Amino acid sequence: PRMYEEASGKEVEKVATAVLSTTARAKARAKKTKKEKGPNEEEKKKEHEEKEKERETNKKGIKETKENDEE
Amino acid sequence: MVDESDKKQQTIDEQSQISPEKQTPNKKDKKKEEEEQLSEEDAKLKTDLELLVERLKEDDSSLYEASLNALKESIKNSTSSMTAVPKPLKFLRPTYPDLCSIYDKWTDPNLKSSLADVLSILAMTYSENGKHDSLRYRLLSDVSDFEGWGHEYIRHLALEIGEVYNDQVEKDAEDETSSDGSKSDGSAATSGFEFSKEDTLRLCLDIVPYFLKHNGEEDAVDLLLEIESIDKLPQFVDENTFQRVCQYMVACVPLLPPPEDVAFLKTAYSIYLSQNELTDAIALAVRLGEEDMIRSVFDATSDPVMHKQLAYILAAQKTSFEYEGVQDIIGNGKLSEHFLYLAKELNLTGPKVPEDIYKSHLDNSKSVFSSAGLDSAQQNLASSFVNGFLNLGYCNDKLIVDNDNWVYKTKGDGMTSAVASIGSIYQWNLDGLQQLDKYLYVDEPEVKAGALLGIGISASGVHDGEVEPALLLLQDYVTNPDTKISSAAILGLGIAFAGSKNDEVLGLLLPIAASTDLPIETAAMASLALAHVFVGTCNGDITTSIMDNFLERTAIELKTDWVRFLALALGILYMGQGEQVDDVLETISAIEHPMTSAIEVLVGSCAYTGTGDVLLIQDLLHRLTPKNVKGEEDAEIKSEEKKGKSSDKDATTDGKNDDEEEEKEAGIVDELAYAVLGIALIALGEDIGKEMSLRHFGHLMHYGNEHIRRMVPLAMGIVSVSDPQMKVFDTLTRFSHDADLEVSMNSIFAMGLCGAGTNNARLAQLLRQLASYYSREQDALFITRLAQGLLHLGKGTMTMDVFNDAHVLNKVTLASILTTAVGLVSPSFMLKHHQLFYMLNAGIRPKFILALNDEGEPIKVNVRVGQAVETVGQAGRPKKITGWITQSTPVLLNHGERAELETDEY
Amino acid sequence: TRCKLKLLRMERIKDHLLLEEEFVSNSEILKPFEKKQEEEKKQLEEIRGNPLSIGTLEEIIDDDHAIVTSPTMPDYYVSILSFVDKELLEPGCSVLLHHKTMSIVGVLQDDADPMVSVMKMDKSPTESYSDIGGLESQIQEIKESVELPLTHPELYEEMGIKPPKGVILYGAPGTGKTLLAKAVANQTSATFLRIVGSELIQKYLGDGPRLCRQIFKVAGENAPSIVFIDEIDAIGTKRYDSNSGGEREIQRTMLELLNQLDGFDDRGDVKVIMATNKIETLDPALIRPGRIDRKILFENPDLSTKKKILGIHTSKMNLSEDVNLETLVTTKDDLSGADIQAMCTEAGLLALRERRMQVTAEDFKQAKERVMKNKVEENLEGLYL
Amino acid sequence: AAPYAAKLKQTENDLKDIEARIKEKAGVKESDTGLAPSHLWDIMGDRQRLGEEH
Amino acid sequence: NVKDLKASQRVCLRSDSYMLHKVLENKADPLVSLMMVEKVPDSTYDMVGG
Ligand SMILES: Nc1ncnc2c1ncn2[C@@H]1O[C@H](COP(=O)(O)OP(=O)(O)OP(=O)(O)O)[C@@H](O)[C@H]1O
């Protein structure tokens, strides 16, 4: 037997289109938003600590996970 | 055209369009043959310059491109830029257009990318000398007539904007960035910029705003001062200079977010302070939120003068303009001390002089009596409130009141609101107190309580110059143990003092707001009053006000109705700030209860303002969340749940309101679109949600003060006959009140039709009746705005009692509040030294034409209007001062300000 | 540079958000309901067949029937039944019929027709609050009649007079009578009807008097309104053809127009605008004064008026330092406002001719002489001299 | 030409976005004709429509 | 869909129910067929020199 419910995947699909589109739309305003923002983060915190912000975090590059299994 | 040799000079130019002789060949061969022939090259530089100029008049890109192509090679291949240091360095003068010929003239992507980096480098290195600046400059002011020069100097300037921005992003900074190989520091590019700035403000404007904002420093802004202060008298007049400074300030409100703005308004203040419009100095001082700055402009005019002169008079006028009354406090007292004139000065600073001028308008206007005076049931209750609602502002209705029959015939909580409505008859007038004193000392406590509210409303007319403080009278009542009486006393006291945080007033409200353990639904007024007081200056975001709402939840959480009204009061306190309001979202979120979470979403709307385009995407995330959560799951409590939901809906709209006034002003029109389709979504979505949104529309438009008020009230209205909560009608009318019988013509009939036509409940009805009478004013007697008026970037301060009632299901209790609606625009008449009580002329333009300013500047021509009228709200929302045609000159700018004018005639 | 960025700051974020908002909401509308309204819809679709033949409702007989005239050649006594009410209909409104057996199954039109579509416009006006100068006075006469009742009706009531109905713009070509009406319409923020009077007339007969009715019918639904029937000259006294195929059409169509303008009532809430070349291309009595107030005769700009038109154009083009503002006026003699715009287009083409990026002195001088040469007479000074 | 050139394309995209916005809007309109007192008219409505009588 | 059909879109239909087929951008009028008759423009300025 297969999966015979996909009703709740419509809800996922609807809210996926909302958040992603605004994000794109915002980009023009988003440029200046970053200048405003960085100082208040210095004043407060990044997201929970005042360290691991001596660079961007501590790595220029990024961690991606890629699965090349094909069996 | 083509090869035609050396016969005359014309024909040398035509030859080098195909292949140069004295330019590309000669120099190139010379430099790679010998290194002592560099002295011959030097002379051959001048010869190249004139031939370049001559052939900078040919519109085809190909016959300048290819000709000088190989010069581009030479930069690094033969010259090498270090063989004899100054000499190779200074022969990079022909090579810089040549690079641009491939860049801009030729549009081929590959090459455009590659030579951008190079142009930045060779620019920088050659500006050390300063002859690269001079190279830019011969193109800035031109030496050629064609298309070519009109783009090239512009291309140079963008190069600069690119690099500076890249240093912000990059964490290496200087030329250790790989963007171009270049820095915005050192001694090599900094000096290039310095020279660049000087010239382009003088003649152009193009690179000037990009430098300022990129640095983010008040220093950059202080260079802008030096250049502008020169320009203000010999190159353009005074008037033209005033327009520059405010263009800069109004334009960059949504281009400088809060932390960014504060370092900048400091420079803008200084500009104004030096300048001849001290009116602009003071106006700007309100922005900063700084008391100190307001005080400085006043002290500067008062102290080094020992005479009435222009100086004392102008000071009174500037401070008078805010109906915050914050400026009122500052400005009076120093006048008492100095002892010039008491009689002209103290009154002119305080709200005393606005009473005299209303008298002349009122005399023309008469008093219209169309109100009902029905008796029995709810019809008694309806009629007695409507009577106050139809003679709002200073108007006469005295003889009607003096028959105390219909007044005394009300009962209950209605009785309390009937004594209250009486006070708004004589709103913004010294008198009023007479009618009220009589009721206050006889019968039931209900009628005493109502008196106190009225004294508050009347007392907006005199509460400065140290004369008639509301405090003296209203204190005795706070002391009294009964709840009705004491609540009334402290609400009315806030209204009278307005935005002033006068010490006596403040200090009465400070020990209290900390016992709300006692369950009293009519004890809102404790925090509600303190909120009204706070707004007008930079907000404390006081910890007492935040504490007591939580105490209320400890004692009782069965009666939600009280705890919903409290939550709104905290967010209204925090308006007029945004920097400091980021901290307090965290203070509320510290405690976790489903009830406390209700508090957080309101106050979030106030925190994120002025970068409210982010606020928008968030208030949409809000919509989605009930449904999204539900989806996943498919594959005592009652009070907490209900507060939860409703707060969200309220916030979505509050969020919008705060944003649209402060950043945009033109953009409000578009934002109105954002609202109407938003409102539909919530109205359809939840039923419970639909109630909040119906009332909210009327106040949405009023907060933004729309430029188009024709369509929007009237459309909603028809739909809302079917829709429940007839309070819907009351909220549309509060906006429609405006400029009477333009917005209001359709409205009075439509609202009267629904009540009169069908009675489907005496409950639904009571609202339907109240609405019609409420909009009207007799002969366009005053307008209403949910704005300062002085700034249209601002916000109300006396209008917050109006604003409050839109989260609320309809009730008798609510009626009590609604009697207050103080904050009325004074008519912007012309004054003399020995007082004149009318206008002469004004320009009106329904919609301003300018997009350099959007505050409310239209052209000099306008459409000409006469005297003796209040400030129009539709068809003349911006208002300009007309003088250029009448050979007569105003001293005090007017741009749809609240502000009264003064003119000098010669 | 800085302020065109500010237009971008306001328009990009608010507008881009608005598209996205609509697009999710179309899904979101559906989800609140799942019975009741869904059910009623479901049975509306069972009842109403596919396709539906259009009807036009002539009249309602009060007994659960009506009579329609349809693009099907014989008329029908149809019934009013199923998801429609007796008072959801009004006569003369367009109805939807059932293919098999004609019945009014509801309305989703309500005066939706192609002639309505041409007439209503969602376009932006070309001029807003007299962008181009000249004719200062004439607009302060349109405004008294048209804009002024809409904006403030109260002032007419103190006065005790009835408020005006309509204006007639007429006289000269190239004076921008058709553009002042567009200006006035944007100033108020009224509903504008660009219908053209010439778009009711076709070879085929008997269609026309329907079209005349529909204008007055739609205008009243969306009132307040400003109606512009542009170029009512063609439907004037004149005839279509001297043979055949049009002896009737002009005669019925004009008469039918006067009738429903008067028959409204004497309103000051739906204004009409008749744009016409002259009263010599129309009938000698229209409908005919006290009722059609006011009449505006356009004539040629005078030296003051043509200065004003010119100053607008010259500033939007490179240079004015070369040849004084006054020197342009002086050289020109009095002509319509088109001739003033024409000199500036030709000037710009002449800068292209040279391959300059400046409008030089030479360009102004030639461009002035050209227009004067079209458009010429010399027997004014030949009779004299 | 960077001050006006770049800002020209930006102007253009907004207008096109607005045209697209209007075709998204008009494809859905207000539901339907269904009214509770004429849902009772439906009982008689099936019989007469299928019959030979109009 | 009714998001795929636009205002002023020409379409094909049956005749026994007038049920839609698909979208068409070829709009057929006598003026458009006049372009088919005329064919392509021809000639060059030097053929018509002088
Ligand atoms: N007051 C004004 N309003 C508008 N444009 C004006 C005004 N005065 C003069 N003009 C000038 O007149 C020009 C010609 O206008 P236009 O050709 O549309 O004329 P019209 O009288 O409406 O014509 P038609 O008879 O061709 O329908 C405008 O482009 C403008 O340069």
Ligand SMILES: [Mg+2]
């Ligand atoms: Mg015309």
